[PDB]
Amino acid sequence: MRECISIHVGQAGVQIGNACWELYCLEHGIQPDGQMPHHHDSFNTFFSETGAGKHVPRAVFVDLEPTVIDEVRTGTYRQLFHPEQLITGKEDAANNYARGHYTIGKEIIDLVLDRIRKLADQCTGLQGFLVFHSFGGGTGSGFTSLLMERLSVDYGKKSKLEFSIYPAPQVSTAVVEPYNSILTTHTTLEHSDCAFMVDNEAIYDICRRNLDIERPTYTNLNRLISQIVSSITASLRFDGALNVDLTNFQTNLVPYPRIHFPLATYAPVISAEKAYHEQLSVAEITNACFEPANQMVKCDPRHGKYMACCLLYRGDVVPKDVNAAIATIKTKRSIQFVDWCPTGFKVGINYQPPTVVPGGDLAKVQRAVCMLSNTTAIAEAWARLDHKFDLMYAKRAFVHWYVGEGMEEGEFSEAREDMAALEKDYEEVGVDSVE
Amino acid sequence: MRECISIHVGQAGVQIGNACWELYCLEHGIQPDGQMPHHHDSFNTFFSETGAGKHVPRAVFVDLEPTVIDEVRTGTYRQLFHPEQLITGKEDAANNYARGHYTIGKEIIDLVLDRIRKLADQCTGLQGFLVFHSFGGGTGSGFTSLLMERLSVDYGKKSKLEFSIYPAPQVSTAVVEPYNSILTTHTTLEHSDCAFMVDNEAIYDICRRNLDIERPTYTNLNRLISQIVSSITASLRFDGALNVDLTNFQTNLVPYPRIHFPLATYAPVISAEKAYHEQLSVAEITNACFEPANQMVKCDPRHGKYMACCLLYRGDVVPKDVNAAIATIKTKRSIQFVDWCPTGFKVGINYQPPTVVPGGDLAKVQRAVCMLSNTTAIAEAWARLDHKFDLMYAKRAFVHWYVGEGMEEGEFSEAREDMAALEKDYEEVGVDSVE
Amino acid sequence: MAVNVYSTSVTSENLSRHDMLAWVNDSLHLNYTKIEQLCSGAAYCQFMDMLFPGCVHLRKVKFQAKLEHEYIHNFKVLQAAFKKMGVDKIIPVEKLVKGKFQDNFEFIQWFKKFFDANYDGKDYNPLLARQ
Amino acid sequence: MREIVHIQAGQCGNQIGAKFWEVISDEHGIDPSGNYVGDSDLQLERISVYYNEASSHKYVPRAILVDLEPGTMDSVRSGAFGHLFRPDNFIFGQSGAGNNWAKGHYTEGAELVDSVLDVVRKECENCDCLQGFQLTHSLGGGTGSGMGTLLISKVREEYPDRIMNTFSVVPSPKVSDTVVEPYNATLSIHQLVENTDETYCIDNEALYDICFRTLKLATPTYGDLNHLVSATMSGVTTSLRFPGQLNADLRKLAVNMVPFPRLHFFMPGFAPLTARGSQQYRALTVPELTQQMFDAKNMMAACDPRHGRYLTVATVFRGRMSMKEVDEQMLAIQSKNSSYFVEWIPNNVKVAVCDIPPRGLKMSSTFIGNSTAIQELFKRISEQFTAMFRRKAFLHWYTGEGMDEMEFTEAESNMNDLVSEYQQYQDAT
Amino acid sequence: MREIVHIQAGQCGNQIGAKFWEVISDEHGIDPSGNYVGDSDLQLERISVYYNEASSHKYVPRAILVDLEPGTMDSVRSGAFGHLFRPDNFIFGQSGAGNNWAKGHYTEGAELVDSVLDVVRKECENCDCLQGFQLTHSLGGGTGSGMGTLLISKVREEYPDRIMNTFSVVPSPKVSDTVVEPYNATLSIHQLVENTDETYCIDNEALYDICFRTLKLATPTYGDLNHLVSATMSGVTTSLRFPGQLNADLRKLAVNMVPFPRLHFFMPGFAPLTARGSQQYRALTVPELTQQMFDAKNMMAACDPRHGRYLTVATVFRGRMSMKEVDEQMLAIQSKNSSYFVEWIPNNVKVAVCDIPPRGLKMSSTFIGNSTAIQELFKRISEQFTAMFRRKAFLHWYTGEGMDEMEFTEAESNMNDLVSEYQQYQDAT
Ligand SMILES: Nc1nc2c(ncn2[C@@H]2O[C@H](COP(=O)(O)OP(=O)(O)OP(=O)(O)O)[C@@H](O)[C@H]2O)c(=O)[nH]1
Ligand SMILES: Nc1nc2c(ncn2[C@@H]2O[C@H](COP(=O)(O)OP(=O)(O)OP(=O)(O)O)[C@@H](O)[C@H]2O)c(=O)[nH]1
Ligand SMILES: Nc1nc2c(ncn2[C@@H]2O[C@H](COP(=O)(O)OP(=O)(O)OP(=O)(O)O)[C@@H](O)[C@H]2O)c(=O)[nH]1
Ligand SMILES: Nc1nc2c(ncn2[C@@H]2O[C@H](COP(=O)(O)OP(=O)(O)OP(=O)(O)O)[C@@H](O)[C@H]2O)c(=O)[nH]1
Ligand SMILES: [Mg+2]
Ligand SMILES: [Mg+2]
Ligand SMILES: [Mg+2]
Ligand SMILES: [Mg+2]
């Protein structure tokens, strides 16, 4: 009855969404062709049923380069998606923010908005949009910045959750990542309700250490991402003792208009071999999700303070045991809250145990936790990126590509001083003040 | 409801622990794969019980050289242990206390402590630690010292029992044994509640004479030590007419802060052929356990005076018979006590007869005695070890290795003076004094 | 930074409850009658101020705590300077706040050793510091 | 006669109410399908107070269940025991209030209050003689607190000469279910103390404590907590549903326990509470029932009575008992525990006795005491609100939907004033 | 009427109490399930003194079993005749006292006595007219000694005008069960002398001698020892439990046997004790009963009365007999055996007669002597403590948990003063 649509831009969004939509069809028992064969509409919020038994997803796959999307048209999920929704261009943005925001993106933005408007009108109880985009890309960073300016105008006040891919501190696929990341953050800082952050390097440590896989390809990495996403909207599709909505994370995790950068975390992540030798009780999976070696962004929360938290259990979870486990977590002192936040926990319990994808690495479990911490420790992640941008912009390296594609050298300075204000605001609010 | 955990350090510790855990799994009726077909809970005190019927031990096998741990992994007890609990390094300490305590052992101590903390937080009624380690071994000595320091820092006041392997006067396998023993004794003289001592040569003599085996490999010694440990823990594990605890042993056997080096003895040790021709009465098993040739440390208590004694009977034992036998033993000539200890016996009785490992050397018995004596005869062993250390250190042998691996001669000098002070205190306390 | 100490088994240094209470009462000038009354954490916070000037904001600590929930907040300020000072002793504040003889003597026994190691003989009154 | 209209708002109200109409149906012998299947004729003597006669001896409850988010209705409409509610009363919105005051009181609650006042008004006209309203909600949520308060203000204007009770679930000190708890609680208390006759404050942390030690349970779900609150909610009403030696009702309790118009915050209780295995080792008698009431362990709100003085106390016994033993022990309790009762209110104990014991029990009773220890609950909330409001944390989503800083100032001063009047009557002589 | 509250401490207290309740249930005809199965109504005439009535005519013992280590509680619950105790009374900790008086009096004692005092207060207020308390324990263990001392002190503080008996298992002189006996023995005896009323000292070696020689048993066990002790205790209580020609009570016994406030250490004994084979060759009569009673070999405390003088003697008979025979034999015994009777206490014999013989016996008798032979036991314990404290052994583990040498010195001084006064009153003319 209540609807939410998802938009995937760039290669990272399409590849992640390809693994995410495989999970939804498994949870609701949807065959790849669209037909159908705690437990008990459910699929209505994500799948729009047609006249026949076919259910088509509410997804809009958009990219400029047609290489990745053509795999979806050919792959096993060929008859599921709506043929028109897969929007493709001719040439990529080529890791250039200007190309995907001023020159090439402008020729396709009108086609995308037409399909978005057609999906919204077909539905009645639209909640908000979920956007899966990267940060170092050209059409995943310069185009999703154009979508925010357009979506926020057609629809005034709606939830807009983003699932970004933070550039790693040491691991780096591109060389112009500091240029695209700084420009994107300055523009989508006023058109994003909350932006969950994920780093690619941090997932490698989780898969190698906890799950014990020595060959974590991008398909094994994208399986961990989809589990968090399904946990965010688990209460919309299932009935639980204490439900939450997309607006609940919105109010509970954003104390200030600019401070809306939480970092996700999942638990438990264990292999099948170690599943038989572990009790996996509520009292310790809460502890597992709080250790600094399990966070999914390469930043240690010990150096900062927790502005707010949000836990989302699911399965055979007793509401009494959650209170006891959380009460002693405030006792343990890997946790340090802020002075002006006497209450700093939000709990949501669901009655649907997490499902497993056959052929995957995760084992079947009866309990799960998806913590969404909003900590001050992410300020060190902005400082590191702001240092790379300042070093490379000093000698105007790589600038001639941006200037000649429809941007001005003055615009580069405006985004630089904006991140200086964000860094100052983040530290000043977090640090204590007299009276 | 009462939980005690065991830490095995070094090759000797790992092998002794393997024998001990085989004995425990036999005693509690646990199959090698972890399933199971006075007794009920019992296994709760040692075996943590998971979601299925599988019970996993509360053991932390730690080593630097991976050979023995890989042997344990490949062995028949493969499905029992938790795979994460088995911790290995890359290269051994190589009979170097400096290598095992300062350079190498500092790179795995954090993981060991994290696993120990997780195991302790899993349980609710934690009682103490049982540490199985040797003295001659470099990794055993160094890592036992490090673990003692770290556990004493983390947990304030808990029972920390150790089952050492005292170097034999003649039988030996190393050349830096005096150095290692002196250093480890000086370091962990203040971080041990009670340190039971066991020697290889005495067990060799016992197995040669009493049990009549002419090929006594290390398995028989491991079985004997495991039997002693199980007899010690039987009071916690089972019900009985007169129960004793780890704190009971600790209180009744340590009269002075430094004099906490008791020696163990077991009875009766007879083969299968000699079992049919013996009555096995309480008085005669008490006499056998009190005989000098049955002691498991190469020192005859006739040269010293008993300071404290602890008898532990298991089986069809009558307290009247125990009282009569103990009164007769106290009357006997060879048993001499200290003047300031008018009462010198602590008696415990248990209703569970000892079990027999199939294929083992020992035969089935209905009565068993474990005798722990804190006496003065260990002063001669301390003096012999001190003389060996002084003779070797008079001309600075192997000190180049020890100094090159992050140590200074000041540590050697302080260890020497501390051992001299300990010997002086032991002699002064043991000797009589007027008024 | 501060030098750490341990306490597992030491003789000739274990003080009685009467002497330990006298040392606490005389040092900070209160009228404590039971060692189980130290679970509030108010007296403990002032000890850190004496040992190291500053490093503890004596305003956010409340001394009139009488329920179970401000005791937890009190300890969140007492040894939050432990991380600042580098001392790595972790106490069971979840179990300390119950006001039992079980741990309230064990922690004060350790604190006496810790206080004696880092005390250089400085003297200051607590009357104006408290008010 | 003297019918009671039941209103359930939020998620807790819909979950407590769903477990409340199970107790009432069992008491009156009403089948889940909605038709009488009982045996004793005393049950049907006064059935119109809660239920409502329809065609073919079908009884439908006189309750309306309304919540902004539609996820809760499908849990009770499609679940068991959902075949007896009238489908018209199932009122729901489109999206949840998002744990917000303004989204539950100005923006999204204003579009639904006009569709719920036309069902209360219609239910009131079919009534013979209205007695009062009942509201079950939470003080920490968005729609349970935001729009449940809006219903109180609208109803009070239409029916000023009526008595309504709120079975609120006040937040807990140890854990917080919502990070922005104080903003919703403070803004609601300032509205409750205006136009409610009496309020029963209930806690979740105290329900875990009671169920863990007294009831000796290991895994108390929310089904067991609501089953414990529902017993107290039925104890108050049962005096006007069944004949008794000394009858009472909603109006009688309000007169005896509200000395001043701003002091109507009560702390409920219940007895006996025993485990399944340890029930044959106790003698069920009035002696030990009154002993179980007055111990601080068996209190439904996390407030120790030893920190304050009982202003007034009312106990509603049930079952069949001698009338002498009841008065003999309230004198002994008052005489022995003479230091915890106020001095300027003599004989501050109200007694009522019914004659129908609950299902599967020889005798029981309910305790409702207006104490002064409640002041420690309002002192804690006003402390948390001050810390957050000074830094303006989370406030820029309460201003963006109608409200302003000026509204927050009144809610804090009013709550601080009520605390001062609550303590002034404790030390007064 | 005249209810008695029973408290059991430590492993010894728990086992002795289990045997005692076995004997009491057999005497009163109470089925192990807890319901009356007996025939005569004289058992039901006075059953509230020990048992407690409960719904469905059940009977629950008025016992409070408590010990730090849970092993004894698990054994008593899992074993037979554990289905009648009230589970609330089952109180235990997690870690034992470890034979440490400091640990049993200052570390676990706090919470344990808080819970125990709560239960004791509830039981006492449930009782109609309290008569006294009973505590069975050992002076050698840690938990029993220290925590029974703490319980006695708190009960004395709460109920000053009440009686309590302590059945203490004193350490043996020949063989010691624990190495550090004297410290606990001295501290416990000091506290008991301070704040108890009467104490029946019982040894183990004397019981073993009695069982081996008189009973002619090859393998005497703790079951038989506890059987003998429980028989003595039941014989003590039967005087007020049952009607008789010349009744006696606990207060009567205390008044008659305690001449001075510091002299309440009695020696018990039982008659007749005969082997199974040699029971049909004896004529059961008061002459031989008294003859078996009044010989040192039939003494349950390892002290030879020939080394001292009987300050006072009490004799509780059972069964049916003749007062003429009883008093005539008492006079004959006093006249023939005058040498070891105190001269300045004329008429130093108290006699009481009941009317119900024990199960499977025509008649029996319990003898309680306040003599001066306990001086040797106190002297031996004081000498051992003096040696151990002079050499300062095991003491840093009493100093490390609160105590100090001042307490030990005070306890030793009190013990020496008590023994000196005992001797000086033995040798008075
Ligand atoms: N976690 C995750 N990240 C991915 C995956 N595939 C690509 N990425 C991220 O995407 C980045 C590559 O840039 P993209 O955002 O994909 O750029 P694009 O979509 O190819 O568009 P152009 O920049 O115009 O070429 C890499 O740095 C990766 O971090 C994936 O499968 N999983
Ligand atoms: N009783 C007994 N002693 C053993 C056994 N295995 C080894 N030892 C003792 O252990 C000593 C060898 O030193 P270890 O502690 O094992 O040293 P390690 O584990 O090989 O590691 P490194 O010290 O680095 O060489 C020998 O002197 C033996 O006395 C065993 O199975 N039984
Ligand atoms: N006693 C009891 N309390 C509950 C139960 N379920 C939820 N609660 C309490 O009710 C609160 C839920 O907030 P609500 O007022 O119901 O909010 P909502 O109905 O979900 O609507 P929103 O505020 O917009 O999210 C939680 O803080 C819980 O403490 C329950 O089953 N029993
Ligand atoms: N007569 C008799 N005495 C017993 C029996 N069992 C134990 N005892 C005595 O009671 C003492 C036992 O010490 P306890 O006070 O029970 O100590 P605990 O319960 O084991 O716990 P700790 O005090 O910590 O050691 C022993 O010294 C025995 O002499 C019994 O069955 N009959
Ligand atoms: Mg691309
Ligand atoms: Mg090795
Ligand atoms: Mg809601
Ligand atoms: Mg014990």
Author numbering:
A (entry chain C), B (entry chain A): 1 to 37, 40 to 42, 47 to 441
C (entry chain T): 1 to 131
D (entry chain D), E (entry chain B): 1 to 429
Kindly provide excerpts from the paper associated with this entry:
Microtubules are tubular filaments composed of αβ-tubulin heterodimers, which adopt a pseudo-helical geometry. Microtubules switch stochastically between periods of growth and shrinkage, a property called dynamic instability, which is critical for their function. Microtubules are stabilized at their growing ends by the so-called “GTP cap”, a region enriched in GTP-tubulin as a result of delayed nucleotide hydrolysis after GTP-tubulin addition to microtubule ends.
Moreover, we could demonstrate that polymerizing ‘mosaic microtubules’ consisting of a mixture of two mutants, αE254Q, and αE254N-tubulin at an optimized ratio, can eliminate mutation-specific biochemical effects, thus generating a faithful mimic of the GTP cap. First, using TIRF microscopy, we performed titration experiments of 20%Q + N-microtubules to measure how much mGFP-EB3 bound to 20%Q + N-microtubules. mGFP-EB3 revealed high affinity with a dissociation constant of 14.0 ± 2.6 nM, similar to that observed for pure αE254Q-microtubules. This affinity is also close to the affinity of EB3 binding to the wild-type GTP cap (39.6 ± 5.8 nM), in agreement with these mosaic microtubules being a faithful GTP-cap mimic. To this end, we imaged undecorated microtubules and microtubules decorated with an N-terminal fragment of EB3 consisting of its GTP-cap recognizing calponin homology (CH) domain. EB proteins were observed to induce compaction and a negative supertwist in all previous EB-decorated microtubule structures solved to date. This expansion means that the presence of a glutamine at residue position α254 at the catalytic site can inhibit compaction, possibly arresting the microtubule lattice on its pathway toward the GDP-microtubule lattice state. Considering that any previous structure of a microtubule decorated with EB3-CH showed both a compact and left-handed twisted lattice, we can conclude that the presence of αE254Q can block the lattice compaction of a GTP-microtubule lattice, even when only a fraction of tubulins carry this mutation as in mosaic 20%Q + N-microtubules. In WT microtubules, a negative protofilament twist may be transiently required to facilitate compaction of the GTP lattice to allow for efficient GTP hydrolysis.
